[PDB]
Amino acid sequence: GTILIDLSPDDKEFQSVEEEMQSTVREHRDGGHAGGIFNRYNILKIQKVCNKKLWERYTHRRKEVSEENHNHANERMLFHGSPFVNAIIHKGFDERHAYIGGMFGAGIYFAENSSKSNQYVYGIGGGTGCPVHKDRSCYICHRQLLFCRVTLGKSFLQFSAMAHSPPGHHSVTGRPSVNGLALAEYVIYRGEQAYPEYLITYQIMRPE
Ligand SMILES: O=C1N[C@@H](c2ccc(Cl)cc2)Nc2ccccc21
Ligand SMILES: [Zn+2]
């Protein structure tokens, strides 16, 4: 039931998504090992992900969280990178998309930094890089990320350098506590708490 609707680059919606993607690139502590060396992207395409059933699954869960948290879903737009991007957009988020080994337990992880999600496009640690060249810093091959609507509800704050949410919380927030430039990362433990709104196709660009 999923359809992908291409956005024109002239559309304000394309432009505001491209800007969140570009403006939230940062340097990483691995010097580019996982995700490659780049300061910006070449955005090739942005598509709206349309699936009525998956949307109703999200809004239903959203209302449940909202009603457990003084009518506040605490909804964010966040990036997700995964080798399973095509299963996600067709069947929705679930336990098979969890980062079992993540620092805040087995759950589904999202980033404010687009460059952080870029590190998982080819697997944990970047895997072996692109399928074609085996290069984690490939500048040729086309990458995809999701820009997702995520319900955090009451989020457990972890200060720092599938399972269940901590009792009385709907998510975990990984607060950056050493790298002053890092933005937060977030974990949900229910796939129904994220909806993959935008499929972004891009290349990382070689710095000049
Ligand atoms: O975009 C994210 N993708 C995940 C991820 C996705 C799929 C698999 Cl298999 C493993 C991990 N990890 C992240 C960790 C922190 C912030 C963002 C992300
Ligand atoms: Zn490649």
CSV table of C-alpha atoms and ligand atoms in Angstrom, one decimal:
chain,number,residue,atom,x,y,z
A,1,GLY,CA,0.0,0.0,0.0
A,2,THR,CA,3.0,2.4,0.0
A,3,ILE,CA,3.3,5.1,-2.7
A,4,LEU,CA,6.2,7.4,-3.2
A,5,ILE,CA,5.4,11.0,-4.4
A,6,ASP,CA,8.3,12.9,-5.8
A,7,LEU,CA,8.7,16.5,-4.6
A,8,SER,CA,9.8,19.2,-6.9
A,9,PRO,CA,12.9,21.1,-5.9
A,10,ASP,CA,10.8,24.3,-6.2
A,11,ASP,CA,8.4,23.1,-3.5
A,12,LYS,CA,8.9,24.8,-0.1
A,13,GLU,CA,8.5,21.3,1.4
A,14,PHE,CA,11.5,20.0,-0.6
A,15,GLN,CA,13.5,23.0,0.4
A,16,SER,CA,12.8,22.8,4.2
A,17,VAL,CA,13.7,19.1,4.3
A,18,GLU,CA,16.9,19.7,2.3
A,19,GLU,CA,17.8,22.4,4.7
A,20,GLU,CA,17.4,20.2,7.8
A,21,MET,CA,19.5,17.5,6.1
A,22,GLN,CA,22.3,19.9,5.1
A,23,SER,CA,22.4,22.1,8.2
A,24,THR,CA,22.7,19.2,10.6
A,25,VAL,CA,25.9,17.7,9.2
A,26,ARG,CA,28.7,17.6,11.7
A,27,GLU,CA,32.2,16.1,12.0
A,28,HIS,CA,32.3,12.7,13.7
A,29,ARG,CA,34.8,11.3,16.2
A,30,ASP,CA,35.7,8.4,13.9
A,31,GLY,CA,37.1,11.0,11.4
A,32,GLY,CA,34.7,9.6,8.7
A,33,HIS,CA,35.4,5.9,9.2
A,34,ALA,CA,31.7,4.8,9.3
A,35,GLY,CA,30.0,7.3,7.1
A,36,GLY,CA,32.7,8.9,4.9
A,37,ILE,CA,34.4,12.3,4.7
A,38,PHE,CA,32.1,15.2,3.7
A,39,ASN,CA,30.7,18.5,4.9
A,40,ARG,CA,27.6,18.4,2.8
A,41,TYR,CA,25.4,16.3,0.4
A,42,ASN,CA,24.3,16.3,-3.2
A,43,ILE,CA,20.5,15.8,-2.8
A,44,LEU,CA,19.2,13.9,-5.8
A,45,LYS,CA,15.6,13.3,-4.8
A,46,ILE,CA,13.1,13.7,-2.0
A,47,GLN,CA,9.9,11.6,-1.9
A,48,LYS,CA,6.9,11.7,0.3
A,49,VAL,CA,6.1,8.3,1.7
A,50,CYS,CA,2.3,7.6,1.6
A,51,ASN,CA,0.8,4.7,3.3
A,52,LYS,CA,-2.7,5.1,4.9
A,53,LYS,CA,-2.5,2.0,7.0
A,54,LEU,CA,1.0,2.8,8.4
A,55,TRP,CA,-0.1,6.4,9.1
A,56,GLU,CA,-3.2,5.3,11.0
A,57,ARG,CA,-0.9,2.9,13.0
A,58,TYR,CA,1.3,5.9,13.9
A,59,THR,CA,-1.6,8.3,14.8
A,60,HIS,CA,-3.3,5.7,16.9
A,61,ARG,CA,-0.2,5.1,19.0
A,62,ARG,CA,0.5,8.9,19.0
A,63,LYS,CA,-2.9,9.5,20.7
A,64,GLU,CA,-2.2,6.8,23.3
A,65,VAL,CA,1.1,8.4,24.2
A,66,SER,CA,-0.4,11.9,24.1
A,67,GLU,CA,-3.1,10.8,26.6
A,68,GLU,CA,-0.5,9.3,29.0
A,69,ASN,CA,1.5,12.6,28.9
A,70,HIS,CA,-1.0,15.5,29.4
A,71,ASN,CA,-2.0,15.6,25.7
A,72,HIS,CA,1.6,16.1,24.5
A,73,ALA,CA,2.9,13.6,22.0
A,74,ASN,CA,6.3,15.3,22.1
A,75,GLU,CA,6.6,14.7,18.3
A,76,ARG,CA,9.9,15.4,16.5
A,77,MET,CA,11.2,15.1,12.9
A,78,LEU,CA,14.3,13.0,13.0
A,79,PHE,CA,16.7,11.1,10.7
A,80,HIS,CA,17.0,7.4,10.4
A,81,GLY,CA,19.6,5.5,8.4
A,82,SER,CA,19.4,1.7,7.9
A,83,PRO,CA,20.1,-1.1,5.5
A,84,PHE,CA,16.4,-1.9,5.8
A,85,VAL,CA,15.1,1.4,4.5
A,86,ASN,CA,13.1,-0.4,1.7
A,87,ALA,CA,11.3,-2.8,4.1
A,88,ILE,CA,10.6,0.2,6.4
A,89,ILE,CA,8.8,2.3,3.9
A,90,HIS,CA,6.7,-0.7,2.8
A,91,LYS,CA,5.9,-2.5,6.1
A,92,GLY,CA,6.6,0.1,8.7
A,93,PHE,CA,9.0,0.2,11.6
A,94,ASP,CA,9.2,-2.9,13.9
A,95,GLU,CA,11.6,-5.0,16.1
A,96,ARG,CA,13.5,-6.2,13.0
A,97,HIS,CA,14.8,-2.6,12.5
A,98,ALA,CA,16.1,-2.3,16.1
A,99,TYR,CA,19.8,-1.7,16.9
A,100,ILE,CA,20.2,-4.6,19.2
A,101,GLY,CA,23.6,-3.5,20.3
A,102,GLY,CA,22.8,0.2,20.9
A,103,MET,CA,24.0,2.2,23.9
A,104,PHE,CA,20.5,2.7,25.3
A,105,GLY,CA,19.3,-0.9,24.7
A,106,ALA,CA,17.6,-2.8,21.8
A,107,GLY,CA,15.3,-0.2,20.2
A,108,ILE,CA,14.9,1.8,17.1
A,109,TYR,CA,17.4,4.8,17.0
A,110,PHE,CA,16.9,8.3,15.4
A,111,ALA,CA,19.3,11.3,15.1
A,112,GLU,CA,19.0,15.0,15.0
A,113,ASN,CA,22.2,15.0,13.1
A,114,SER,CA,21.7,13.8,9.5
A,115,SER,CA,25.4,12.8,9.4
A,116,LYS,CA,24.9,10.5,12.4
A,117,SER,CA,22.2,8.5,10.5
A,118,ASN,CA,24.4,8.5,7.5
A,119,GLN,CA,26.8,6.2,9.4
A,120,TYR,CA,24.2,3.4,9.4
A,121,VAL,CA,23.1,3.5,5.7
A,122,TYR,CA,25.4,0.5,5.0
A,123,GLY,CA,25.0,-1.2,8.3
A,124,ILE,CA,26.4,-0.8,11.8
A,125,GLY,CA,29.7,1.0,11.8
A,126,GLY,CA,29.1,1.6,8.0
A,127,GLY,CA,29.4,-2.2,7.4
A,128,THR,CA,31.7,-2.8,4.4
A,129,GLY,CA,30.6,0.4,2.6
A,130,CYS,CA,28.6,0.6,-0.6
A,131,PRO,CA,27.6,-2.7,-2.4
A,132,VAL,CA,29.4,-1.7,-5.6
A,133,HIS,CA,32.8,-0.4,-4.4
A,134,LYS,CA,33.0,-1.6,-0.8
A,135,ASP,CA,33.8,2.0,0.2
A,136,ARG,CA,32.2,3.6,3.3
A,137,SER,CA,33.2,6.9,1.9
A,138,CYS,CA,31.9,6.3,-1.6
A,139,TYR,CA,31.1,9.6,-3.4
A,140,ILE,CA,29.5,7.9,-6.4
A,141,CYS,CA,26.9,5.6,-5.1
A,142,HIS,CA,23.4,6.8,-4.2
A,143,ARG,CA,22.4,6.7,-0.6
A,144,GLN,CA,19.0,6.9,1.1
A,145,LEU,CA,18.0,8.2,4.5
A,146,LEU,CA,14.5,8.6,6.1
A,147,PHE,CA,13.3,11.8,7.7
A,148,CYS,CA,10.7,10.5,10.1
A,149,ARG,CA,8.0,11.7,12.4
A,150,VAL,CA,8.7,10.3,15.8
A,151,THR,CA,6.6,10.4,19.0
A,152,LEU,CA,8.8,10.7,22.0
A,153,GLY,CA,6.2,11.2,24.7
A,154,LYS,CA,7.8,11.3,28.2
A,155,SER,CA,11.5,10.7,27.3
A,156,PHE,CA,14.1,9.3,29.7
A,157,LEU,CA,17.1,11.6,29.7
A,158,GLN,CA,20.5,9.8,29.6
A,159,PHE,CA,23.6,12.0,29.8
A,160,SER,CA,26.3,10.3,27.9
A,161,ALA,CA,29.7,10.3,26.1
A,162,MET,CA,13.4,-5.0,21.6
A,163,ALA,CA,13.7,-3.8,25.2
A,164,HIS,CA,11.0,-1.9,27.1
A,165,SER,CA,11.1,1.8,27.7
A,166,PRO,CA,12.2,2.7,31.2
A,167,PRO,CA,9.1,2.4,33.5
A,168,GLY,CA,6.9,5.5,33.0
A,169,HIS,CA,8.6,6.7,29.8
A,170,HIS,CA,7.9,6.3,26.1
A,171,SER,CA,11.5,6.8,24.8
A,172,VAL,CA,15.0,7.5,25.7
A,173,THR,CA,17.0,10.6,24.9
A,174,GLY,CA,20.7,10.3,24.5
A,175,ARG,CA,22.1,13.7,25.5
A,176,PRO,CA,25.6,14.5,24.2
A,177,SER,CA,27.9,15.0,27.3
A,178,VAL,CA,31.5,15.5,25.8
A,179,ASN,CA,31.3,16.5,22.2
A,180,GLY,CA,29.9,19.9,22.5
A,181,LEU,CA,28.9,20.0,18.8
A,182,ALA,CA,26.8,16.8,18.8
A,183,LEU,CA,23.0,16.8,18.7
A,184,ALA,CA,20.8,14.4,20.5
A,185,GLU,CA,19.9,10.9,19.5
A,186,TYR,CA,16.7,9.2,20.5
A,187,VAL,CA,15.4,5.6,21.0
A,188,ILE,CA,11.8,4.2,20.8
A,189,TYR,CA,10.9,0.7,21.7
A,190,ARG,CA,7.6,0.5,19.7
A,191,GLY,CA,7.7,0.7,15.9
A,192,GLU,CA,4.3,2.4,15.9
A,193,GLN,CA,6.0,5.5,17.4
A,194,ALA,CA,7.7,6.5,14.1
A,195,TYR,CA,6.3,7.1,10.6
A,196,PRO,CA,8.8,7.4,7.7
A,197,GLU,CA,7.6,10.7,6.1
A,198,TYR,CA,10.4,11.4,3.6
A,199,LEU,CA,12.8,9.2,1.6
A,200,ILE,CA,15.8,11.3,0.7
A,201,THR,CA,18.2,10.1,-2.0
A,202,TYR,CA,21.7,11.7,-2.0
A,203,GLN,CA,25.4,11.4,-2.3
A,204,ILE,CA,27.9,12.6,0.2
A,205,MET,CA,30.2,15.2,-1.5
A,206,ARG,CA,34.0,15.1,-1.4
A,207,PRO,CA,35.3,18.3,0.3
A,208,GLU,CA,37.1,20.7,-2.1
B,1,LIG,O1,19.9,6.4,12.1
B,1,LIG,C1,20.2,5.6,12.9
B,1,LIG,N1,20.2,4.2,12.5
B,1,LIG,C2,20.5,3.2,13.5
B,1,LIG,C3,20.6,1.9,13.1
B,1,LIG,C4,19.7,1.4,12.0
B,1,LIG,C5,19.7,0.1,11.6
B,1,LIG,C6,20.6,-0.8,12.3
B,1,LIG,CL1,20.6,-2.5,11.8
B,1,LIG,C7,21.4,-0.4,13.3
B,1,LIG,C8,21.4,0.9,13.7
B,1,LIG,N2,21.5,3.6,14.5
B,1,LIG,C9,21.4,4.9,14.9
B,1,LIG,C10,22.1,5.3,16.1
B,1,LIG,C11,22.0,6.6,16.6
B,1,LIG,C12,21.4,7.5,15.8
B,1,LIG,C13,20.8,7.2,14.6
B,1,LIG,C14,20.8,5.9,14.2
B,2,ZN,ZN,30.2,3.0,-4.3
